[PDB]
Design goal:
Layout (H helix, E strand, L loop, with lengths): L1 H7 L3 E3 L6 E6 L5 E5 L9
Antiparallel strand pairs: 1-3, 2-3
């Protein structure tokens, strides 16, 4: 449910977070929902 909503927020479940990506939710199979955050501005918060 948590990163199911992350899926809606277009967060991809990967092992290690990539470019400007942060860990927002813990998935199964050791995947983590990482959001590709937009730079230049104050992230997403």
């Amino acid at each position: 449910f948590f990163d199911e909503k992350c899926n809606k927020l277009k967060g991809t479940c990967k092992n290690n977070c990539g470019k400007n990506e942060e860990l927002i939710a813990l998935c199964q199979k050791s995947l983590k929902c990482c959001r590709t955050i937009q730079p230049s501005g104050s992230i997403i918060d």
